[PDB]
Amino acid sequence: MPMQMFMQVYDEIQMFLLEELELKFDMDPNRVRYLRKMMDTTCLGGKYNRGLTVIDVAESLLSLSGARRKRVLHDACVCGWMIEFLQAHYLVEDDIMDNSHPDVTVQCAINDGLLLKSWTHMMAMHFFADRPFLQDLLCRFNRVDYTTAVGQLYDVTSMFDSNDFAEFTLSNYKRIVKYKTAYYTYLLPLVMGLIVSEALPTVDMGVTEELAMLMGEYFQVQDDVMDCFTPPERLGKVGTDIQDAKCSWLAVTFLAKASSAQVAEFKANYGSGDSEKVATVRRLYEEADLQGDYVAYEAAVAEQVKELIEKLRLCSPGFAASVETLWGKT
Amino acid sequence: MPMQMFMQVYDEIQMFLLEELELKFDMDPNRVRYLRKMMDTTCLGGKYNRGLTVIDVAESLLSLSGARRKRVLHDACVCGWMIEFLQAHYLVEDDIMDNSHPDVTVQCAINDGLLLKSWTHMMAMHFFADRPFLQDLLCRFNRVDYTTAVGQLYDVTSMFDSNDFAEFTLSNYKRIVKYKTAYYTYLLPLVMGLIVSEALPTVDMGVTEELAMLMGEYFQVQDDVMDCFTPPERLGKVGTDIQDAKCSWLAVTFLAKASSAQVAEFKANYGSGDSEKVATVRRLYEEADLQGDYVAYEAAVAEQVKELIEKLRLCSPGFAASVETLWGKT
Numbered sequence: 001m002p003m004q005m006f007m008q009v010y011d012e013i014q015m016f017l018l019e020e021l022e023l024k025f026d027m028d029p030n031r032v033r034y035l036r037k038m039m040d041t042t043c044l045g046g047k048y049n050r051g052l053t054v055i056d057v058a059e060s061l062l063s064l065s066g067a068r069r070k071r072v073l074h075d076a077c078v079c080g081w082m083i084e085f086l087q088a089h090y091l092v093e094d095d096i097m098d099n100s101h102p103d104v105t106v107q108c109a110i111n112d113g114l115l116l117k118s119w120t121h122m123m124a125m126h127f128f129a130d131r132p133f134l135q136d137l138l139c140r141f142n143r144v145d146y147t148t149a150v151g152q153l154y155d156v157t158s159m160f161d162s163n164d165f166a167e168f169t170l171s172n173y174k175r176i177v178k179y180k181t182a183y184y185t186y187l188l189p190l191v192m193g194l195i196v197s198e199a200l201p202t203v204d205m206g207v208t209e210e211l212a213m214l215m216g217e218y219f220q221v222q223d224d225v226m227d228c229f230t231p232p233e234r235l236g237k238v239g240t241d242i243q244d245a246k247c248s249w250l251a252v253t254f255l256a257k258a259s260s261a262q263v264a265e266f267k268a269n270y271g272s273g274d275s276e277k278v279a280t281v282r283r284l285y286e287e288a289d290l291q292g293d294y295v296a297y298e299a300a301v302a303e304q305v306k307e308l309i310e311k312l313r314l315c316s317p318g319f320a321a322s323v324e325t326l327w328g329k330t
Numbered sequence: 331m332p333m334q335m336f337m338q339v340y341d342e343i344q345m346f347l348l349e350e351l352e353l354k355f356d357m358d359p360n361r362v363r364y365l366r367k368m369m370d371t372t373c374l375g376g377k378y379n380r381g382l383t384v385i386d387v388a389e390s391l392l393s394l395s396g397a398r399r400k401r402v403l404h405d406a407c408v409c410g411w412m413i414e415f416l417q418a419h420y421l422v423e424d425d426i427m428d429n430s431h432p433d434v435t436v437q438c439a440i441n442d443g444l445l446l447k448s449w450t451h452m453m454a455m456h457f458f459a460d461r462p463f464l465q466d467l468l469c470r471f472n473r474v475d476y477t478t479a480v481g482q483l484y485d486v487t488s489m490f491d492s493n494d495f496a497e498f499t500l501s502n503y504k505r506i507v508k509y510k511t512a513y514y515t516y517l518l519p520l521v522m523g524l525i526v527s528e529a530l531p532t533v534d535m536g537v538t539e540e541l542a543m544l545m546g547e548y549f550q551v552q553d554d555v556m557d558c559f560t561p562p563e564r565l566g567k568v569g570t571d572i573q574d575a576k577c578s579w580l581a582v583t584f585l586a587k588a589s590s591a592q593v594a595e596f597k598a599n600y601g602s603g604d605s606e607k608v609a610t611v612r613r614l615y616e617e618a619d620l621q622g623d624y625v626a627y628e629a630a631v632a633e634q635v636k637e638l639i640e641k642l643r644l645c646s647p648g649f650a651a652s653v654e655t656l657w658g659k660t
């Protein structure tokens with residue numbers, strides 16, 4: 001039911017946006033079908049983890065606060081697609097970076113990124129036009145989007161001096177995860193479910209924020225280990241953190257427990273595209289027993305998560321019963 | 331006074347944004363100074379035509395409707411910088427297209443473009459937090475921003491079939507000018523001046539929209555002719571419309587009055603980087619007496635502008651006395 005309903009609302013949102021362009025923006029059919037194909041290509045196909053969470057939060061809050069049910073669930077579906085379109089916008093922005101007379105493909109990619117972001121506003125301004133939360137929804141959405149761009153700056157420049165391994169620390173790694181990922185992937189869907197369920201001021205936002213940051217940290221650490229050790233045909237992509245000199249959990253944990261000569265061997269091999277230098281880094285990770293530390297670190301984070309949900313149910317029992325699927329889905 | 335006041339409010343907006351990052355987004359001083367330099371580089375140095383217009387509209391409306399004066403003028407200055415930051419965002423997006431291991435300059439440019447746009451929201455959400463128009467201001471701003479991205483699509487794909495000279499027509503040229511430029515350069519500053527002056531529903535928006543589109547058309551036609559005939563050291567850049575096969579006023583006017591063999595000569599030479607093919611196109615423009623038609627076309631547009639301002643003063647005399655500088659500044 002949630003996935004089926006989420007996909008029906010997608011057709012409703014797409015048709016509004018495309019008809020709006022045809023009827024109010026003077027768009028010709030060729031470009032309308034061009035934009036329908038682009039929207040499907042960039043927004044569909046993922047797992048919809050962020051979008052379906054808005055639904056799951058909304059349905060749990062109308063079970064413990066007729067027509068109010070139908071409207072809230074539909075509102076949650078629009079909010080879910082706002083985040084999905086936002087995610088598609090971020091992915092298109094990423095494709096422009098690694099992809100490299102007017103090159104019309106780079107022009108259209110930049111145009112795609114601007115349209116996907118604007119569509120989050122257009123669908124909000126339309127389907128929520130008569131909602132009292134429309135102004136608060138836009139402000140929280142815009143602020144979280146700003147947060148993500150700030151975290152991208154922290155990530156992209158973690159190895160330099162914005163006009164290097166000093167910023168390879170656990171607290172900075174958490175700062176990167178916090179802003180680059182956790183706020184829009186974990187905090188934003190939860191907040192949006194609360195907004196459409198009219199239960200925003202009824203929850204402890206501090207414990208909510210703290211949970212979202214902890215869950216983003218847990219899933220980024222797992223992502224970092226898989227990026228390095230999971231082979232490409234099983235990970236789904238090519239792990240490139242070592243070559244890209246990312247401030248990953250493996251790097252900052254290694255630098256703390258490595259010897260001075262191992263740090264020199266790591267610093268001399270990190271951030272290179274050569275096959276043997278990357279393998280030299282993986283060898284250092286293995287010999288430092290990092291995957292042994294990975295299990296303990298995740299377990300400790302899991303314990304902080306498995307216990308912070310309890311502080312939240314004492315004032316919001318249904319809300320905490322929506323984050324129940326944080327471990328019904330890893 | 332307007333320029334001096336506009337620049338003081340810039341310092342106020344910059345300091346808020348940078349302190350917000352330092353105090354609420356955990357940003358380190360090195361990156362704060364990096365962002366101060368980026369903000370100055372991208373937002374300052376232009377002519378501030380869009381931003382100062384919000385001020386000029388605001389000061390004319392408090393002369394024919396104490397503390398309300400000071401607040402409205404300051405609000406107009408923030409709205410002016412929203413458009414300037416929006417313009418800087420569009421320029422950065424343009425630099426990414428023509429500029430072409432993780433290339434950190436392309437990553438930072440994309441990051442710059444996201445930050446400049448988000449800053450328009452952050453300064454609005456802060457300085458207008460207690461204003462009743464904050465929700466309407468954001469929606470009109472977001473819609474105009476969406477409009478511009480749609481016009482960029484019309485422009486960038488004017489010579490192809492979105493998966494060619496059929497779309498080289500006067501009505502499509504106006505459609506490109508309308509969405510790509512006129513809405514955010516001419517309509518948006520006027521609307522924003524009305525919003526902060528609490529005089530939005532007091533003006534004929536139709537004549538206002540019609541004037542903004544006509545003034546954008548006039549200045550784009552003049553821009554198109556200068557791009558082709560004004561030498562680079564006098565234009566300020568290198569005119570590249572012929573090489574880029576832009577749907578310019580010269581091209582669509584030429585295609586209407588050229589002979590079948592001249593059209594073939596134009597089609598065989600348009601959109602090339604070769605020195606002689608570009609000069610062949612300029613030769614065709616000269617022999618078709620296009621610069622003779624340019625004077626008449628601008629004069630006719632000027633007459634429509636010099637007369638549409640009168641329809642607006644019969645219900646908004648002070649407003650039309652703000653667009654007076656449309657010809658006190660060409």
Ligand SMILES: Cc1nccc(C(=O)N(C)Cc2c(F)cccc2Cl)n1
Pocket residue numbers: 049050051053054185186187189190215219323325326329330
């Ligand atoms: C890509 C990815 N990897 C792992 C998890 C997620 C995710 O956000 N989920 C599963 C939904 C979710 C949420 F939106 C907010 C708070 C908790 C949760 Cl569980 N996404």
Ligand SMILES: Cc1nccc(C(=O)N(C)Cc2c(F)cccc2Cl)n1
Pocket residue numbers: 379380381383384515516517519520545549653655656659660
């Ligand atoms: C780059 C450029 N070239 C020519 C004109 C402008 C411009 O927008 N001006 C001068 C301000 C302005 C406005 F914001 C709204 C309506 C009318 C006017 Cl006159 N900008």
Ligand code: NA
Pocket residue numbers: 046047048049050051084087
């Ligand atoms: Na998702």
Ligand code: NA
Pocket residue numbers: 376377378379380381414417
């Ligand atoms: Na301007």
